[PDB]
């Protein structure tokens, strides 16, 4: 019973994610370092938790300062890098060289599994 | 690119999760005091959305950050904007329109002309 005028922006969530990706790439305002085959990746724990049940479990209730997470040897840079890029851009690209590793990393880090999707194109 | 997937919902889903964290006060890293009332957020999101906050966030220490907004900023005007930041929806009302318009200017590079919404007061 109060008059209201509401705006829903179709660009805002995309624009926030673009800004979070720029922070990640330029290593500013991030708060977690992920070690993958010993190589350093920077991210925001809030975004990793939103995007991966594996990371969420390693992030709940941790200390307030910089956090370090080491992923085990099952996770390669080849399979992980396309996925952190999907988390921050909404776009996932798989190459002939990395498709197997990425599929393995999706299953390892998330509740999803893309093997059966990729399998549908095996014959043509 | 043997396979390429583009998700039209992913950015919305990440923002939904950030909003849930904000409201439940988990995985946040900045407190904002507005008329003394406590709000929680992620400095990364505030810096992405507000030039005022960005200037008060970059280069600060890694631990918890605390920002006190001055008396110019009212809860009435600020709360609809933090809600827009975290949800992409801005609700203007008869009661809040002038204050929200003032806080937009105060906090960001944008402007909303209050004169264009005075019909909310009819």
XYZ file of C-alpha atoms in Angstrom:
246
model
C 0.000 0.000 0.000
C 2.993 2.255 -0.577
C 3.747 3.297 -4.149
C 6.976 1.802 -5.446
C 9.109 1.911 -8.556
C 11.471 -1.007 -9.087
C 14.329 -1.480 -11.547
C 15.817 -4.851 -12.314
C 19.126 -4.486 -14.121
C 19.945 -7.086 -16.735
C 23.666 -6.139 -16.733
C 24.489 -5.845 -13.029
C 25.367 -9.417 -12.096
C 27.554 -9.739 -15.230
C 29.226 -6.431 -14.422
C 30.028 -7.480 -10.825
C 31.519 -10.774 -12.065
C 33.644 -8.890 -14.656
C 34.951 -6.710 -11.870
C 35.689 -9.702 -9.633
C 37.562 -11.328 -12.557
C 39.596 -8.180 -13.096
C 40.485 -8.182 -9.347
C 41.486 -11.822 -9.621
C 43.695 -11.338 -12.693
C 45.352 -8.239 -11.310
C 45.631 -9.812 -7.807
C 43.877 -7.081 -5.913
C 41.210 -7.509 -3.224
C 41.600 -11.277 -3.252
C 41.859 -13.294 -0.084
C 42.777 -16.892 -0.876
C 45.742 -18.470 -2.595
C 45.146 -21.862 -4.235
C 48.201 -24.051 -4.869
C 47.707 -26.349 -7.871
C 50.728 -28.500 -8.700
C 52.460 -25.978 -6.454
C 51.555 -23.082 -8.752
C 49.817 -20.063 -7.241
C 46.306 -18.933 -8.182
C 44.535 -16.046 -6.431
C 40.788 -15.824 -5.818
C 38.091 -14.677 -3.425
C 36.925 -17.354 -0.977
C 33.339 -16.075 -1.236
C 33.299 -16.833 -4.981
C 35.094 -20.182 -4.639
C 32.571 -21.259 -2.006
C 29.677 -20.183 -4.228
C 31.067 -22.198 -7.113
C 32.474 -25.451 -5.630
C 31.341 -27.746 -2.809
C 34.952 -28.913 -2.383
C 36.196 -25.371 -1.805
C 33.220 -24.475 0.361
C 34.150 -27.272 2.738
C 37.731 -25.863 3.000
C 36.527 -22.279 3.489
C 33.693 -22.396 6.139
C 34.956 -21.182 9.499
C 38.548 -20.400 8.508
C 40.567 -17.567 10.032
C 39.843 -14.053 8.831
C 43.237 -13.353 7.210
C 44.754 -14.676 3.996
C 43.833 -18.315 3.466
C 45.910 -20.928 1.655
C 44.393 -24.033 0.026
C 46.479 -26.757 -1.583
C 44.746 -29.001 -4.048
C 46.019 -32.604 -4.230
C 47.836 -34.172 -7.158
C 44.563 -35.345 -8.773
C 44.007 -31.721 -9.793
C 46.312 -30.410 -12.523
C 46.796 -26.871 -13.714
C 45.536 -28.058 -17.102
C 42.223 -29.142 -15.646
C 41.844 -26.350 -13.068
C 42.667 -23.222 -15.032
C 39.652 -23.510 -17.383
C 37.373 -23.977 -14.400
C 38.536 -20.967 -12.346
C 38.083 -19.028 -15.526
C 34.522 -20.353 -15.876
C 33.837 -19.469 -12.215
C 34.852 -15.871 -12.953
C 33.486 -15.414 -16.512
C 30.504 -17.812 -17.081
C 32.373 -19.256 -20.090
C 34.017 -22.680 -20.251
C 36.229 -23.710 -23.151
C 37.573 -27.239 -23.508
C 40.349 -28.184 -25.927
C 41.367 -31.585 -27.242
C 44.382 -31.273 -24.959
C 42.543 -30.404 -21.706
C 39.071 -31.978 -22.014
C 39.884 -35.082 -19.973
C 41.609 -33.159 -17.186
C 38.812 -30.576 -16.998
C 36.134 -33.295 -16.777
C 38.104 -34.929 -13.975
C 38.415 -31.576 -12.174
C 34.692 -30.785 -12.452
C 33.845 -34.038 -10.725
C 36.561 -33.576 -8.119
C 35.681 -30.024 -7.172
C 31.916 -29.736 -7.747
C 28.545 -31.472 -7.603
C 28.462 -31.494 -11.436
C 29.734 -33.932 -13.993
C 30.192 -33.114 -17.671
C 31.607 -36.415 -19.001
C 28.249 -37.632 -20.374
C 27.644 -34.277 -22.114
C 30.998 -34.404 -23.909
C 30.467 -38.099 -24.650
C 27.421 -37.302 -26.864
C 29.680 -35.952 -29.629
C 32.162 -38.831 -29.751
C 30.974 -40.302 -33.074
C 30.878 -37.228 -35.367
C 37.669 -25.064 -28.735
C 36.309 -28.576 -29.046
C 33.630 -27.619 -26.565
C 32.474 -24.184 -25.498
C 29.812 -23.536 -22.912
C 28.383 -20.112 -22.013
C 25.998 -19.885 -19.011
C 23.359 -17.164 -19.032
C 22.554 -17.772 -15.304
C 25.998 -18.210 -13.757
C 26.678 -14.549 -12.839
C 23.190 -14.299 -11.301
C 23.810 -17.481 -9.360
C 27.146 -16.216 -7.981
C 25.523 -12.962 -6.921
C 22.672 -14.920 -5.255
C 25.255 -16.828 -3.277
C 27.120 -13.664 -2.280
C 23.838 -12.165 -1.159
C 23.052 -15.210 0.951
C 26.498 -14.971 2.562
C 25.944 -11.258 3.195
C 22.545 -11.772 4.860
C 23.776 -14.713 6.943
C 27.062 -12.968 7.784
C 29.424 -15.646 6.557
C 32.465 -15.240 4.333
C 32.228 -11.447 4.595
C 35.173 -9.194 5.275
C 34.007 -5.597 5.788
C 31.605 -4.037 8.270
C 29.870 -0.784 7.254
C 28.248 1.387 9.959
C 25.374 3.528 8.712
C 23.607 5.677 11.329
C 25.514 3.395 13.671
C 23.679 0.298 12.349
C 25.937 -2.634 11.347
C 25.986 -3.990 7.783
C 28.239 -6.795 6.533
C 29.566 -7.188 3.008
C 32.483 -8.266 0.812
C 34.990 -5.532 0.057
C 35.443 -6.922 -3.436
C 31.739 -6.381 -4.235
C 31.551 -2.921 -2.626
C 34.691 -1.834 -4.523
C 33.213 -3.171 -7.750
C 30.035 -1.142 -7.281
C 31.014 2.093 -5.559
C 33.868 4.518 -6.209
C 33.419 5.852 -2.669
C 33.947 2.427 -1.161
C 36.712 1.534 -3.609
C 38.838 4.486 -2.422
C 38.382 3.255 1.186
C 39.130 -0.411 0.378
C 42.142 -0.572 -1.886
C 45.408 -0.933 0.007
C 43.789 -1.513 3.379
C 45.006 -4.295 5.660
C 44.117 -7.955 4.945
C 42.127 -8.550 8.117
C 38.605 -7.336 8.855
C 37.897 -3.811 7.526
C 35.522 -1.308 9.200
C 34.046 1.695 7.367
C 31.824 4.291 9.008
C 29.657 6.256 6.650
C 29.057 9.907 7.663
C 25.721 11.386 8.769
C 24.872 12.333 5.138
C 24.085 8.672 4.490
C 20.938 7.290 6.074
C 19.874 3.683 6.481
C 16.785 4.615 4.448
C 18.932 5.654 1.510
C 21.727 3.089 1.846
C 19.856 -0.159 2.447
C 18.078 -0.173 -0.953
C 21.511 0.323 -2.606
C 23.326 -2.463 -0.804
C 20.339 -4.591 -1.730
C 20.697 -3.530 -5.397
C 24.439 -4.230 -5.270
C 23.740 -7.806 -4.137
C 20.575 -8.554 -6.095
C 20.415 -6.304 -9.242
C 17.007 -4.947 -8.125
C 16.511 -1.360 -6.836
C 13.204 -0.569 -5.106
C 12.279 3.151 -4.770
C 9.373 4.109 -2.501
C 7.510 7.190 -1.487
C 9.365 7.005 1.811
C 12.896 6.458 0.544
C 13.238 7.963 -2.924
C 14.916 11.239 -1.980
C 17.399 9.571 0.367
C 18.266 6.822 -2.131
C 18.913 9.423 -4.793
C 21.210 11.298 -2.421
C 23.151 8.174 -1.480
C 23.601 7.167 -5.129
C 25.398 10.443 -5.812
C 27.298 10.258 -2.528
C 28.524 6.720 -2.990
C 28.892 6.133 -6.735
C 29.633 7.523 -10.182
C 25.921 7.343 -11.084
C 23.052 9.723 -10.532
C 19.281 9.341 -10.255
C 17.302 12.586 -10.549
C 14.841 12.686 -7.634
C 12.669 15.142 -9.548
C 11.783 12.303 -11.963
C 10.184 10.232 -9.173
C 8.151 12.736 -7.176
C 4.978 10.984 -8.370
C 5.924 8.328 -5.798
C 4.825 10.932 -3.240
C 1.280 11.326 -4.587
